[model samples]
Target: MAEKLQTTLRVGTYFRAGHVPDGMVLAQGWVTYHGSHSGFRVWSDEQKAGNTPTVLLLSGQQDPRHHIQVRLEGEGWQPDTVSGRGAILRTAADNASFSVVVDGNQEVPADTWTLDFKACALAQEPNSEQQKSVDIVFSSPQDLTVSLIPVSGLKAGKNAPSAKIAKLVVNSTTLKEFGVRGISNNVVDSTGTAWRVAGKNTGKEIGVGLSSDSLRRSDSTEKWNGVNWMTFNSNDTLDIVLTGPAQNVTADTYPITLDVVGYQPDNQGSFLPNSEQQKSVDIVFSSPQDLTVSLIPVSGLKAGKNAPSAKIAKLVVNSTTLKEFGVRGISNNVVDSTGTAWRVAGKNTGKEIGVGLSSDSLRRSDSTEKWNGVNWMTFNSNDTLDIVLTGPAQNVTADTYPITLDVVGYQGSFLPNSEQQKSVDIVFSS
Candidate 1:
């Protein structure tokens, strides 16, 4: 199947130029009215058929009796007779009637008058006689060429300031596609000369930002005194300080990606570093750990000074101890000497605990008091046992060390199924 295309027709006026007529009477006055007429037929080339329609052009002041009618084309031609005070031409197409009358007594001059017709629609085929037409006639010898142009296409109603003329100008259709909007001339003036003519490129604007490649470093840092701070890394945290206008500096964190171009002087003005030059590495803050960002400006500089040496840019922190800490986890607990009992407590502690067991024997009576002989338990010489004291020990510190206790049937591995272990330490106050 063939693809279909869509199009739309905009509503606007169209014009056609007219010519002067020979041997026509011309009225002379300060303001004389003019009249003309032309005829056209509509037809289709594909069907090879013609359709006829009569059209006329009549003009004068709006007076009932003094109007004139110039006939275009048709049978009987009664509309061509100018006998009544004014003239009215009625057509059968839609029963539309056109009247011509004189508004004032000023006589129209004999010179050729240009006739402007608007809002005309054309048939798909040229030979169709349903088309409208007009005849243009003037009193004197004058050269004329009829041009069919759209009235809507003409631009002549408004004016802009001379300063904005350049901005007002638009490119012809062809020049616009390639992004060429306008052209500007190079201009120069003496130091004291005031900029007068709308300066070239006056209204043109463009935005520039840092490029990704420019900030693609891994260890960059920036340092600033009140007046100036240098960026050491293309991609690292930079220290910034504000003073004067920025005295009450409040730091705000925002996502910023910027391109920085550095300049160095060699006797003359400063020049940009060559592409191959070793640019400072950028310290990129991949996570919170990578950021030790701070701002501190030198004491003397103020904001908005002509050349205030205020440090307001980014900088890298040199102190490794100042580096931010990454995420971490820790655990703490207590266990007895014999491998049977333990009390463990700590954040993010491991899943299992091991109690050390002493090979020294435990009395049968003590074992009976602790375990009811029904609960299954494992015993290991290396495991430790835990015992809760009746009263807190003097000079005992909370969580100071694991608790210790002796156990019987101490044999095999301590807590054979468990993995972790804690040490026990005893201290007594004098």
Candidate 2:
């Protein structure tokens, strides 16, 4: 007795005739089988005989006695015909479509079966109309899952920083046979702010985090319908080039989501939307501000009559955020806890101590106005600036003079600067 088939099943893909325009896809998805040994062909024009339906079945799971028999031929145009596993179908001009027929040798059992129709091609002569060839890759039905990795030490600027935010792994080993491709997506924060350019790859805004044998879409001639495509590997990391909020923005956490698209690769080193899947990953971005300031004693002030200003110490500023950090300017002059200014040459240090900022630690060498301007001096990572202190030339105090200065610095384009009160004890000996 013939057993009943299932309600539905993912039968195979259909490749239409060459004369058909558009994507060359005729039909796909769950096809119903009436009974065992009685097969059905999708689309056939037997009366016209202009284009014959050619169906090539690559692989299937069925009983040995009830295995499917596939036929691939040009039908009337090309005499050559092939069948069975690993059969390459070549259709000539006007060769329409084929059918997937089952041999009536025995009654097949009613159970789940898998059929994989790998690829389809069309051949044409010179000076003839163009016939589009389609490459198909069949993937097992397995849910591909992904997770976002935490990111840190990322700077904010146009094309300045990159982060590997996620990793993907196929749930089943069967996926490796088909391979993955066309991995790309857009990144946005909770507030709908985009972290990358709309369509430009400036500074390599996105990249596959593969160490070797990487493939970029720029090296291929496949027109992926305006979407950027990259070859993806299971468990490979995905890195995104990003720009962030403006400098001076509040340093807070930003929740972000990215939608990644992955497709199965065809035998022709290309990809189609047979098993297209979109996976989303959630991640958070903390403000990238980690600035530290300190002082390093360089030299001592000379206590004597008609003494020149000496290099007191150097102020070091550093930021692990790797963003642009700069000194805004000095808010106040050198002073003690009592607000008494150190006496120096000229009226520059009348009530306050005579202090000047310099690029180098030499005595009155380079311009000493480095610490008195707005965003005037900037450095990435870490830098040091010299502080020159001047005391009264005559009757100079021989004791340690405790002094303080109100300095200001800022991050990239950040306003309302960071104020740091620096205090250092200056030793003056005759």
Candidate 3:
């Protein structure tokens, strides 16, 4: 009796593309182009299993024209105003690689101006779907001239992202009224420079910090820069944050967009995006917001004395108390395998991340029978790792054993936020 067969997997109405990079389409399926403040994760295997699985999106495959208009450059020229009318590429050989990268000047290298591209779309008949995360506004050497619009029954399953009052906000939560001359009638035109308007995000504040009357008055001078809030996926579930400055950066190679425009309408609920008037999210600006440490509990560690010129003797480990504002973003998980070493003194001097810069003498495992061992765990000045033992406390192990304190730490790199990591083990319950 040999009968075992099981293969069950059903789905449809598909439009695959997660990180949004390849050819850059989403309704019919396409990729390549990682910007527009990125993030357009879509996945629909067509006819997603029935109940009404239909998907056709064409816009203009062979001249059934619905919409296609492209003209948004920034580097070579074409910038007086531009805010993403995106989605066009039936082909002029793919519209000469349709460009859209409002700001990649990173830190404004010399004068590379980049930043400008805001969009939204998702329509076409067939419905009844399973997944769709449409946040359109994409381009990366993908070519454009897209402006399609067709209507045929429309009622399948999933087709969202055409709210109509969407001025912008994924983290702003809500509040982007824009009217009565609000965002100032806006004017995006891009290829490299021109932001004229910036600052806006109030769901709880995701982006908005441009004092001096907001900014923009060059015909003479002034471009302050630095209004970042980029926190990629260390926040998981694919978090996104694209604040300001590095405005329309042109390109030091691209990826630092800006411009949020103020707010004036929040009935309180907050959670905007009804008809995107401006939105280009993608960032990378960091600082000291990812570190916290603790480890202080070692009262009276006993057993000592076994000397004779002290070739071996004294497990004597007592004084170990620290309080110099207490260390944070810590390291030193114990040196080489597990030779356990720490002769640390107070205020601990700070250094633990790969450990190796100036004073570090720890490498034991019977090095011809270790004397470099004197009870350590250091970062001391006149403090005390004050350790010593050639063979007195021999193989330390009292009643509670579960140690893990690897050592040798000195993690450098912390300027404007160019950090590093390698020392952390604030625990050794043995």
Candidate 4:
């Protein structure tokens, strides 16, 4: 066998301009002007051409004793070499194209002089290592799409994972302890421009109402029934509520977890109805997980009387953490996905059920087949579910299945003594 050759890979250091390796003598350059703006015009003559030739002129005032530097600005200026002090100008013909001119003189020795050039100040160096590398036996073969969600009401601290998912789920757990602040209120026209609260506290004992210009016209008003918000109320204990869709769900039914953060008016008194300084609460969302859902047919059946409808039997899934799943940052939104249908009674059993499989002309009839009859009717019980169907009916698949949920917990400098908030990510794979 031929001798295997081992290749050595070396990392290169990064340095800004003007900064050279240590122990290296910095270069220098200078330029002497005989008359006002009379120094060599090292500029391109062509209208569009760049880095054109330069003209050198020497004046009596310009003395060989005066140190000169060749510098370049804007366009058309080129330096043969660069150093801390300046650059060495290159020559073209017997007429020193890159030499220093003094006292109306056209000729000068290029090797006998030094130069200095103006440069922008360098930025502060990054504290991390200048060079780094990782040895690997294999390289990634596919393009990866990293999804992340941010949650509100959490105190994220340093040393926390920088990954997107880590910031959403892990960091949000600390929202409650870090109470929210800066609460404000705004009033808009009645053209459906009013705001309402959504979530578990919408109606039941949670008085909800809205306040607007007493002289302003009123079109309609509504309230929350624990399912959706209709109107607003000032008496509500939870004054600062996220306004959106109705979120009336029981823990047994929705299984969706939420991190809640309450904000109360500080000693500054109540927030004005419509003012910039009005008290307001900030909400953050965190945790984002990518999910794939597949629907499998229980048995091969087409759309017809004999064909069985596809239904969810029981969904078996494993997640990094449930708290990190579902919707975050928003309140009263439908955090559940089509997978939640599995939570229905009787639907949670078995691996498949009837999904109203039938092809009737009145029902937009199509082909009626049975599960197992086609590969499309098969579903796998993993983090994602695949569904198989046998019919001409339009296929119904959720594009946003197994969505990661990030709830806005609390807002404010909750941990007054803490440096910053901390967060983490929970990964889930089949």
Which prediction has the highest TM-score against the true structure?
A: 2
Give the number of the best model, judged by lDDT.
2
lDDT of each: 0.21, 0.37, 0.22, 0.21
Clashes per candidate, residues 3 or more apart or on different chains: 69, 11, 95, 104
Stretches of model 3 off by over 4 angstroms after superposition = 1-277, 285-341, 344-421, 426-430
Query: How many collisions between residues are there in candidate 4?
Result: 104
Q: Please give the lDDT score for candidate 3.
A: 0.22
| 1-430: candidate 2 lDDT, tens digit per residue | 4333222212233221112232233233222333222222222211112232343322322222322223333222232223322223232322233423432233322211234333323223201112222322333223244555545544333223333433334342222221233233543332122343222222233222321222231133333555444445544444432333222222333333343333433454444243345544333333333467777665555555434455666767676644444443232442332222233322222233465554343222211233334223344436566666544434454555555554444443542345555667656666
In lDDT terms, how accurate is model 2?
0.37
Tens-digit per-residue lDDT, 1-430, candidate 3: 2222111121111211123233222222322222121111122221112221121122222123322222222222222222222233221110122232212111111110112222222122101112223222211111111111122222211222221111222222112221111122232322112223222321111222222222221112211132222111111111111224322211111122333221222231111122223334322222221222222324444323223122211111122332111011122343433234322211222322121111222321112221134332223211222123222223232222222232221112111121123232221123
Q: TM-score: which is higher, 1 or 3? A: 3
Cα RMSD to the true fold for all candidates? 31.1, 17.1, 27.1, 27.9
Error of 3 at 379 (Å): 19
* Model 4 worst lDDT window (10 residues): 135-144
**Model 4 / residue 296 / CA error / Å:** 8.6
